Design a protein around this ligand. Structure first.
Ligand code: TRP
Ligand code: TRP
Lengths: 288, 288
């Protein structure tokens, strides 16, 4: 692996909160970011920029697989787009992120080396984004801003104790389905969508660059739909109710019909976790 | 002009709030984004994603000036990075933004045409970011998250009624100085920094891709220092007190020493505007 220390940090942070996330959410970042004795605004920037930085990194990873763009042009693109993000994040509570971002932009021997760096770095920043999303106070605007070929797998949420059986559609997005199946089993933090609607997503431990030709409109997905979003952090997404987002999502599978009614209880508890209580909910996906 | 309607919107939004920002900050976006009867989370996503999208667009504009990357590769880079940002923004309150993002990605007959599209589109998104930053509720975490040659110009703030004299350093970053000087006079909204400390910035009506070799550490800048950040929105930055951001910022000029004592009351009043009251403070920059 190109960045072996990040690999150790990736394996560690699947179950442990990164120390930089804890410092940001408690206002203990050195040099004290934030204007006039508060740390919410810096917290707001830390959470959003690391998320959008991860989106940039994944698209740069995709570009590294595009053979029409030379390695020299790839590095030029990275060296232009990266610094404004990574230098701010290093000052705003992510020194190790900034350290490795500038390491990714070092001269590269080949396309494979650069793709290796970008794939590992993206998964690392994806995990920091995963924890930042879980702890960000999404309820802070509450009250004040209110409206008026079928591979069987098992999904378990703890400490809820809810289990559902599901099927991975291995013949729709075959490369994507194989990428998810090879990561099994894994246990990651389960969090709720904060804009979309009644859906949950969990940052899975992989970076898939597979094509996603088979998609469906998010606001048209059935209850129990398993979809996968590479662009927003390589997340396993479980739809449990009506949604709103109009973008289409790659189809991964579906919870079995005899277990789809079990998802309402999970979505409610996971919503309370992400929105208010921050009590962790752990999703385990395993091969049947 | 490649995108003449954006030029008209750019001219209008210098003094008028874009309807997109008005609907986002009042929870009147037609798609009703946000989970469980609130629109703060969608508001939080709208403000930050449009800001970081603008940062991406500027670095893509700079990439359009790099003739080591072919026009074909530039479009490939744009078509890879852009959709995940623009399609979400089109659903989360910026339909016209997503529309012209697809315009920019269309086949281009020349580098000059594509650079024209990116320069115009970047300024348009920069102004959306400007108004979004002004109206975002930065004080929401206020109580719950707290710690424990020389070209003479005049800067006027209204309706505060305070004027200062300054000098633009035309020999340090020369092309940057001419870019700003060619945009004078302009009157734009004056807002406060929300992370770095006691400085204020205003989105100026230009997109400069000039080199900025002469820089100064932000946390080391003097009182009255005029800085210019191309990468964070082509903003004229007035430092009136201590700061904490460790990055280096391009040096544009400085307020005259005899008028530097007036900046303290402007900064405090601009802080109240950005952080709490949202009463507009208008900055006018003109040559002497
Ligand atoms: N809908 C997701 C966020 C999201 C989906 N697609 C995106 C694309 C870009 C940025 C954010 C998103 C949520 O509610 O959390
Ligand atoms: N200092 C700015 C924020 C900022 C500075 N540099 C940046 C780079 C990227 C993103 C944000 C920033 C503020 O407090 O408002």
């Amino acid at each position: 692996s190109a960045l072996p220390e990040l690999r150790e940090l990736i394996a560690s942070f699947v179950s442990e909160e990164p120390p930089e996330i804890r410092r940001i959410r408690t206002g203990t970042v050195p040099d004290l970011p934030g204007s006039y004795g508060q740390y919410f605004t810096a917290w707001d920037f830390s959470n959003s920029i690391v998320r959008d930085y991860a989106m940039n990194l994944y698209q740069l990873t995709r570009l590294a697989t595009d053979e029409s763009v030379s390695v020299e042009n790839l590095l030029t693109v990275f060296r232009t787009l990266d610094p404004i993000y990574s230098t701010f994040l290093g000052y705003n509570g992510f020194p190790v992120l900034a350290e490795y971002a500038q390491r990714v932009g070092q001269p590269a021997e080949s396309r494979a080396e650069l793709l290796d760096r970008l794939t590992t770095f993206t998964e690392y920043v994806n995990r920091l984004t995963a924890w930042s999303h879980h702890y960000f106070p999404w309820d802070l605007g509450g009250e004040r801003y209110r409206y008026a070929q079928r591979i069987p797998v098992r999904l378990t949420w703890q400490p809820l104790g809810v289990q559902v059986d599901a099927e991975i559609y291995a013949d729709l997005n075959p490369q994507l389905a194989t990428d998810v199946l090879k990561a099994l089993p894994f246990t990651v933090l389960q969090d709720h969508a904060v804009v979309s609607g009644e859906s949950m997503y969990a940052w899975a431990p992989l970076v898939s660059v597979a094509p996603t030709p088979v998609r469906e409109r998010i606001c048209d997905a059935p209850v129990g739909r398993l979809r996968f979003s590479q662009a927003t952090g390589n997340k396993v997404i479980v739809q449990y109710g009506p949604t709103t987002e109009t973008l289409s999502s790659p189809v991964l599978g579906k919870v079995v019909d005899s277990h789809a009614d079990r998802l309402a209880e999970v979505g409610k508890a996971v919503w309370e976790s992400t929105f208010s209580s921050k009590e962790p909910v752990w999703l385990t996906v395993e091969r049947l």
